[model samples]
Target: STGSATTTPIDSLDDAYITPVQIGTPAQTLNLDFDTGSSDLWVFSSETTASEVDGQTIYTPSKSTTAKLLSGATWSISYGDGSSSSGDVYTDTVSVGGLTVTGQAVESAKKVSSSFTEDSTIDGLLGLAFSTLNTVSPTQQKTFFDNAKASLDSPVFTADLGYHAPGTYNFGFIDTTAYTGSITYTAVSTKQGFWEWTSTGYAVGSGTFKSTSIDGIADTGTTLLYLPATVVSAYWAQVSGAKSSSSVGGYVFPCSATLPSFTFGVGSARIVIPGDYIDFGPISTGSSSCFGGIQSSAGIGINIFGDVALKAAFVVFNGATTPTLGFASK
Candidate 1:
């Protein structure tokens, strides 16, 4: 009825969080990026080209008696970062933590982009977004969360992403002890198949809160927090020696610059992101300039509250008929 799993960041920058998942009969465990931005449970498997396989673990459906091929079914997906993977589809037993789902769509990757091949930390991605976003052909597949929602004690899952430490993902029920303060609930729009919501406003460090409505998606798959250009510029302006550099591709500041914390409003609640968290480390090894964790979403079209923002609080993805998102300080 319930399950709990640890999600660890791939590196210090907290680029992504990976959670262990069991696929197939004998249960081949692989570390997968628990992405909330997309919907398609895909994995690196025996179907993948040997040359494309890095140090990542590969799932072999042949070893699972429960595996069943979905004839003519295929899937392909590309991420905002340009990483992509595609393959045939198979229905098999998949488990997250102790929660199990039979006949789950398990996409076996036959082709992967170079970014995926080079990243040895993750074997694949487990999409948690709405099923409408699933890229499977012929029939769109339900996400692991959606498939397991009915059987759960409560149709909800919570994400507690950490900065440099390991966090926990809870399915079926909310862990009261996982967060601090009372949760603030907000309406969520699944129109785009994302956990999208409108933030009340924001404040730059100790500055006064700006009463503006900023609509964005809470994406765990992305690394940085991208807001409106005006907001990003205001934040960066507070930091000494900060500039928007085209060559560097974003706002960068002196590594030693004293950073300012960012605060965003969720109804009447204020969630503050520590300044140190915004310093995304040096632009390059031994470089004096460091990239900012918050950037302009101008070109992105939609603002993204990615890992940089998610790590600051506990997030609840409610699967009610009219879904709602809950935020709590931790």
Candidate 2:
């Protein structure tokens, strides 16, 4: 009855962490990106055209005797980044870590966008967002976490993300040993099917922490930290030779620039993002030009505390009562 599992990153891309999720009666395990931004448990499957699937393993529903087709229903979804998937629905036993849902709706992709198709390693995405966001037609399906929460001892999960290091996603339990300092709790608004919250303020480098209402979402699936245009400009201003490049789209700076630390507010607590994390990485492997990890969430509208920011803290996704986000230094 111990409801917990260790999370492991599939690659050093620092984009997302993948965990094993078993589907069907015979238990076909697939490596899935557990995302909190969307609600859908989709997988690359035999249903996917062989030409569309690159290196991902496909789940064959026929191989699982427990799999039941939800006849006539279909699913289609697109990410803010333009990645998309669409498929038919099937209900089967799905297991994650020590938690299991007897009849979980699994979307088998019949088509996928280039963004996902190119990422050959990822089999599919396992959404941890609210059930209301489910994309299934006729009837929306509940996510794995949503279905399991009713019986979980503690309706909470902690995402311990890291930089090029393996982190963990713990459910129904918080391991105090994984984090340091006190956990600062912030109320979240799930009205948009996202863990949205406002930071009290932000500051660049050792500058004074000025209070500016910054509303953003904690998204595990996203890789970069997205902030308001004004906030982004202010941070880059501190970096020498930083410019908003039309070539690469976002802001870019000299690789040798002494990037200043970016601090963002969470309630009364201030979590500082290390300068190194802000640098993101070189636009090209050996190039002197480097794209910023922090970009303007202009078109996206909502700011996102992606992996770049979340990895700097131990994130607590509290599902008890009103949903709230808790942060502690890693």
Candidate 3:
């Protein structure tokens, strides 16, 4: 069996991608952030604190006859940016696109951070990473992908992220028509519970390709590309009026600056990220300085090939015994 779903950027900056998910017997549709960086399918619901609820849609499990409480089961999660949420667990019939999974673990939020409350666009997050990363206590729960993979034609999923546009997520099978040219396959290490891999190298603009190993994770949950300070500095130095400002918290340049493209190698294949994609918009409303989409991963501990990089290629999260990642130009 196979399934397909549409994912869209929630804001003008393409801050995050959201997809509609149907939960419960009556089908309570809620838009969720399909995050590959974490593993825990959580959602805002009637169990959440009333004061924390905003204009966002909530999943009321009580209304669903198919929803059953997972006695004593609970979950809590936090992101790198400090945003967090915690809640109890429930097993319900959940459907995405045309694929349905019965008894899928659905974490209903009882408490949420202010940041989550502020953004009404996302109802919750659907983790696509390995189930080993699940935060549920006592009995760890499987992700939507894991639970449904057994019956799928192929145990794999593909991410076709767009640049300020709608994209797609395909489960079970690959859509050959979605990409151009042949795919470049690379080994993946799941020890960290992430789609972790190492790149062959990178190049700034039209410069020479640096043949060095750059380790990073393919994270759909993150918004920008993060690399070593040396590489980030090399790219920013080419842009006039660009500087690393402590006040701004990252490298920022004049909005009028003409930026250069960035290229990263996957085996022998090179994926180029357009200059416009690097100009991550103004630091503030009506501000003349724009933050860069690529930043230093110094404090982050590991490099992150987030949406900024994924948007440039078609990514495949192959779930074979020895998992592999496939990249192709789209």
User: Each candidate: what lDDT?
Assistant: 0.94, 0.88, 0.94
Off-target runs (Cα >4 Å) in candidate 1 are none
Candidate that beats the other on lDDT, 1 or 3, i.e. the better one: 3
How well is each residue in 169-282 modelled by candidate 1, as lDDT tens digits? 999999999889999999999999999999999999999999899999989999999999999999999999999999999999998789999999898898899998898888
In model 2, which range of ten residues has the least summed lDDT? 1-10
lDDT of 3 by residue, 106-204 (tens): 999999999999999999999999999999988999999999999889999999999989999999999999999999999999999999999999999
lDDT score, residue 151, model 1? 97
Taking all chains together, each candidate's TM-score versus the true structure is: 0.99, 0.96, 0.99
Error of 2 at 213 (Å): 1.2
- What range of 10 consecutive residues in model 1 has the weakest lDDT sum? 275-284
List CA RMSD, all candidates: 0.7, 1.4, 0.7
Look at candidate 2 and tell me the lDDT of residue 287: 88
lDDT of 1 at 288: 95
